[PDB]
Amino acid sequence: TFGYVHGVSGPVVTACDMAGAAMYELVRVGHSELVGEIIRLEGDMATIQVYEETSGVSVGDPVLRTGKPLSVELGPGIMGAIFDGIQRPLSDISSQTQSIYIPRGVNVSALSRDIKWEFIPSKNLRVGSHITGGDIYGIVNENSLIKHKIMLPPRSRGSVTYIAPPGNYDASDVVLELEFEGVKEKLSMVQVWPVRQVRPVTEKLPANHPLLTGQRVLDALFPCVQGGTTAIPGAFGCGKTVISQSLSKYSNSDVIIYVGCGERGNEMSEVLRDFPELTMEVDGKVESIMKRTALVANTSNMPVAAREASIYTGITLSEYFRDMGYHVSMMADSTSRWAEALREISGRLAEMPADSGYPAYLGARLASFYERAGRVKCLGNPEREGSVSIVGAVSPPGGDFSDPVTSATLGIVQVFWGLDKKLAQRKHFPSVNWLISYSKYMRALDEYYDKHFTEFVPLRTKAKEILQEEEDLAEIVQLVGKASLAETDKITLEVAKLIKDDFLQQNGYTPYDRFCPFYKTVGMLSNMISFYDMARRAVETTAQSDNKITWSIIREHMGEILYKLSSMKFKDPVKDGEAKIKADYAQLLEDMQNAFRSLE
Amino acid sequence: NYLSQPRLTYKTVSGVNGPLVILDHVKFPRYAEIVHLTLPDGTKRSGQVLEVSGSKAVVQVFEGTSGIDAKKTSCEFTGDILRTPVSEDMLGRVFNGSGKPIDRGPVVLAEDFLDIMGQPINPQCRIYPEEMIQTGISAIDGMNSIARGQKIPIFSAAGLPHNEIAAQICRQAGLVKKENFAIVFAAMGVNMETARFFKSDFEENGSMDNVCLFLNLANDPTIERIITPRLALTTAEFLAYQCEKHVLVILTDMSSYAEALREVSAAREEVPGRRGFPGYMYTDLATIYERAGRVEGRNGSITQIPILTMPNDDITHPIPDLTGYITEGQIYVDRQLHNRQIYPPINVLPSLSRLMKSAIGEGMTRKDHADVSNQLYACYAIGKDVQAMKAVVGEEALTSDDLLYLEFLQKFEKNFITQGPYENRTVYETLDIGWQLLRIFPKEMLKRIPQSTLSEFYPR
Amino acid sequence: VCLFLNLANDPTIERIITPRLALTTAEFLAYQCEKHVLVILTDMSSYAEALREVSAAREEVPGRRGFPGYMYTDLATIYERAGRVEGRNGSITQIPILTMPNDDITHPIPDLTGYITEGQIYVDRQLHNRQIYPPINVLPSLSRLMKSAIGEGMTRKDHADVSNQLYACYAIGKDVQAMKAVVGEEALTSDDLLYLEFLQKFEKNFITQGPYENRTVYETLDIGWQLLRIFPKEMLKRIPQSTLSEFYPR
């Protein structure tokens, strides 16, 4: 089976007797089993890019091939796991080695063996039954939330020769046996998939439903669809946690995957410390969010190939959960750190530089990753839908979007929540700059809003216009002062102030703003814009009259409605029923209508 | 256990090529194996195997290859990579870049033989930085407080006093004192006079019992400059993660390390990456710097300050740029303050201790610290803006409040940033100086501070 | 219509053959079947990226921004498969599309394409941010064959003159806008203020058009005159006195 080391130079290990080896095959080098990829073949010889430090590898050392390219073990026991970028299990490395270090050349099986999982076979199946890739042949109760749908691997097919009865089985127990063309395949709960290959689908559907974040600016003005591709300018001064924690606690995705792309050592431990302590309410129980996520963490001194692979590992996990019919959300907290790892591989391969020193294929390696998002009809027969949403942060130096990883990312992602240090310094959380930010999914979500929130598309359009008018009017205020504006424009600044101060801002540490349902979000904006339209009608109806309405008259005779329009943020879906909340909003609409009717 | 088998020794030098010596007929060489060359006159030269292929071992020799030949030269192969002879008795001592001593003391009686290359600290085991290290300098400790386990460079430029700053940190650094703290000081690429400065300054001023000092001279072998950080961090990992010490690892010029890594890369005939440095420098630099942090179930924690001479004064250069990507923050030495004779010339405005919010406050230092530091930063920023305004409009056009930010600015540079090379200030003394400056303003002008903190600390 | 789709995750070397397959179909339909063919090639930037990736893998001599030194010839091997041919009623029209990287007109993808193609149609953020669909910026735009596919039997007589005067007025409008940004509108003459007002009225009526609104060339020229009528007749320095006498007052 194995070859022998012929030469070593830095991480490059040339091996011989490798006549059976394949391009990008995964190889273990040396007596310590150091990981590496074959980057060239030259006869019976192979050149291996060893990931880990090769110091101590010798000529004549064994070179053991795995029968596979770089691949992710998929199966039960992912939830709660922590992985490096190449799927090695950092929690289990810790518990087995009892060391603060990863030992060079770990061989710990990625999904923990020996855990007998509770398995229920898919009760419709029988010996002699037909089956195709993506058929759910049984369910594993790995945690309370995520019933793990075991499925036939996408390339496997045939007739079921055996299925295991209900019972407890570990990942190496043969749960299914099937036959095709007279050839038997024995099959386990563990499933191996090539990480740089897209898990296939019945069809990638158009994305049409909101990925609700529970955050007013993010859900109202810049919506991301389930299946959406999005970016965040993740940098310290902007408060990036406001999105990622809110998504993690509240958002309407059944599973989450985190990729530490290549983050600073201490910033990595913040993620790994924090998430275990976060919790969600499910069916009125409180449970740790680690019940529904896996953290593919990588510090900056993890192997280059692990950082470059880490993004592809996280999406390959996310695609397995998508194929279980779950909606995954995938956070990628610095695509720039991944692009540096990619640049280092290209540099070590002695390839020619392109834009700003990045490789030629940076555009393709980004685009072919973001195209792994979307809603799908899964493979296999229970017709189930699912999705992956990719929330891939960017880190343009000095905020300069001309940086090729940032520019190519903004050339691909349909949504960009442009967090800004100027807003974060003012504590305007969630700190999203609404002038910078955008979403392309507005058109595709019209179906959803038409069915469920039919007035909201008008309100969203009016809100964006009022905010744009605030920035335009602010130039006139800076030139000639607020006193010089028309009455319409003065009330436009007052409503834009309410929108900026009490709609778009949301302090997630407060019990009332921990989350914000879409109905609460619509009701708030409906009242602010109802006030805007009634104030604007009162002003415009009294245009060229003797007695004329103005912001000061409105504030004098109905400053209570201005106070209520701010106060509506404090309403609490936990303490207040939906009917109570909706009724208070309806009462404020009636109150403001009577109040304006008393003037004009 | 150990290498029980004897070393082979080869006269079979097939050639020499700059700093390389090309052995042939070699039995099963290891990549990065240490070798001991002997010249025809009997002089030893140390080297490391830089490449292996079949029977061929490419030795990078540390010293020059002068005197090497194809017949009388002999090369002993040690069968193993370079292991640091680590021990706690490396504190109170001075070593050259290879780890041989230069303080007239004996060779290190190793408590262990640790591979210089280290290993990745398992991310599950890493703990968030959550208490302060005092550095003694007020422009750090009061403004950019370093959390124990933070990585944070001092950026500098050619000719600025960053070595005197690093020396002062080495002397003054320690815990908060509301016994088990050590500096490790990797002095890479240091000219002879500056090496004598560090050695003398730490020996003289009582510090040695709590520092391990590594000196690599500007004319020492370029590969020993590469070994020196890896050697220092391997010692710091021994002191922190096995002997439970808190450790502050100071690296004195990462630019001289980048200018060494460039040579080892050129030695393997690797094509240069961006600006002539090896493309993989991000990983090598990370593999240095990330040997830092607190860890699960241990008290020990490596904090680090990589000093870094920005080439051409420029932050866009890959050396500072990569350091700013790996490290949590930065501190700037400034030519303007230096020319003004303000020592230490640390500029507070572009500086940022990324972790400071977990080094400071109640229990860790004093409850006011963040409020003080924010307000001092704001008053120095507004003071610089008002000083520029005075130069445009004249003093008669300034308000009373402008004259307060300007009097604050003058007193701030003379009392807060200025310190002199041997005045040691606690965090507590720095905050009390902070209040003596903030007291210049009316209570209401201190807008970033909470009214509770003003009621407890605005009185003097 | 025939569609060739190479998706952003499909193997990047197929992008090299994708437009070549499309052209080879267009050549069959035009040059053998006498169809009047239009070829659309979408993101020639993704084609040029495939050339850059292949060039890196081959180790070709690099030109600008790491594209191969032959990028002009390869782009010509795509683009020059266009035009009418003697004895055939057929024709291949092409309207390629490309995303200019970082908006840079001097980037090798637009620049070599600009050398090979018969003028170019430009789309701009300075129109799109103001919601001016379709966001076509006339000023950098030209069509080399407009110097023939106009005038009697093809279009109204005035067309060439109207086009040139609209170009002059829009260009001067941009220049006085650049003056206003330094010295303010109080330094502009009444004539200069009319070119700034022209630039506003022009974008609001000539460029602005609905996504399904279809306008004839003759309708477009009547809009052109209704905009040119903003200036006094004597200022229309690109239009001859005969064309003014036949069309200016109408």
Partner: peptide, 23 residues
């Protein structure tokens, strides 16, 4: 970069040829 890379490839060819010339 491209010139230095092409030089490095020619050197590797010359080394390989020089070893083949020993046969």
């Amino acid at each position: 970069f491209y010139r230095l890379k092409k030089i490095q490839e020619k050197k590797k060819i010359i080394k390989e040829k020089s070893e083949k010339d020993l046969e």
